[PDB]
Amino acid sequence: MNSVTVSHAPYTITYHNDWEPVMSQLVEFYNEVASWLLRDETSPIPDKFFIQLKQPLRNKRVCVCGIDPYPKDGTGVPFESPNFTKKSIKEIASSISRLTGVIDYKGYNLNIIDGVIPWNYYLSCKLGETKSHAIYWDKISKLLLQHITKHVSVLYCLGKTDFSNIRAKLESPVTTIVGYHPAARDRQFEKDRSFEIINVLLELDNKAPINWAQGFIY
C-alpha cells in the first residue's frame, strides 16, 4: 500500500510491503538510469513499469521468469496477453493443456496462479526491439530478482541463451531450472518438461505443488 517517489516518471512507484527491503536502492538506481529508457517509446508504457511490485511475495513459491517484456503491447504484467494473441503465452498454455487435460480455453495468465510470480528480468524495452534496455536495467534487474529468490523455492527461467550466465552471477543458492524459450528451434519447448519438474522439486522442499490449471481463462 506504500509508495516512494522517483524523479523521472512514473514519478510514483506503489509497492506491496514485501518489497520494502529493496525499494531504497531501486529509487537510487532508477534515478541514475531512467532518462535513457524514457528516450524511446517503451513496452510497457512507463506508468506500467513497476505495477508487478504490487504483488505480494510471502505467499509465492515459484518464479516463472522471462528476459524482458514483449516487443509490443507489454501490459506491465509479465507474460500477460489480455486477448491471448502473444506466442509465448499461447505456447505456455499449450504445454499446461497437455499436462492437465484442459482443452477448452480462451486464454491463460500466470498472474492468477497461487504460489507463482511471473517476472520480467528487464522491466522494459524499446518498442519492437528485444533486450534493447539490458544495460539500463542491469543493476535493477539483479537487485529485484535477488529479492524474489529470497521468497520463492524454485526459479524457472525461460531461455537458454538469455539466462546463460545471469542465473549464476545472480548470487543465490535457489533451485533454478533454465529451460528452453517458447520460440526455440526444433520444437524444444514442446519437448520441455519443466512445469512437471517444478512440482517434483517443490515436494522435496516440503512445499505444495503448483496448480497450473489455475491460469486458464474461460
If binding is defined by CB under 8 A, does position 169 make contact with a copy of itself? yes
The residue ranges of DSSP E strands in 125-194, in sequence order, are 125-126, 154-158, 175-179
Catalytic residue among 18, 68, 162, 192: 68
Work out which of 150, 193, 208, 217 binds a copy of itself, going by CB under 8 A. Answer: 193
If binding is defined by CB under 8 A, does position 154 make contact with a copy of itself? no
Interface segment toward a copy of itself; rule CB under 8 A; list 9-17, 38-46, 88-96, 165-173:
165-173
If binding is defined by CB under 8 A, does position 200 make contact with a copy of itself? yes
Work out which of 170, 182, 184, 215 binds a copy of itself, going by CB under 8 A. Answer: 170
In the numeric block, the cell 538506481 is attached to 29
Judge whether 162 counts as a catalytic residue. no
What secondary structure letter does DSSP report for 208? Answer: P
Of 127, 89, 95, nearest to 109 by C-alpha is 89
- Determine the distance from the C-alpha atom of residue 195 to the mean position of all C-alpha atoms in its chain, rounded to a whole number: 15
Contacts 24+ apart (CB under 8 A), 17-26: 18/56, 18/57, 18/58, 18/151, 19/53, 19/57, 19/147, 21/147, 22/143, 22/144, 22/147, 25/143, 26/140, 26/143, 26/144
Nearer to a copy of itself, 43 or 176 (CB): 176
Interface segment toward a copy of itself; rule CB under 8 A; list 65-73, 89-97, 136-144, 169-177:
169-177
If binding is defined by CB under 8 A, does position 168 make contact with a copy of itself? yes
Residues that bind a copy of itself in the complex, under the rule CB under 8 A: 167-171, 173, 175-178, 193-194, 196-197, 200-201, 203-205
Q: Give catalytic residues, as residue numbers.
A: 68
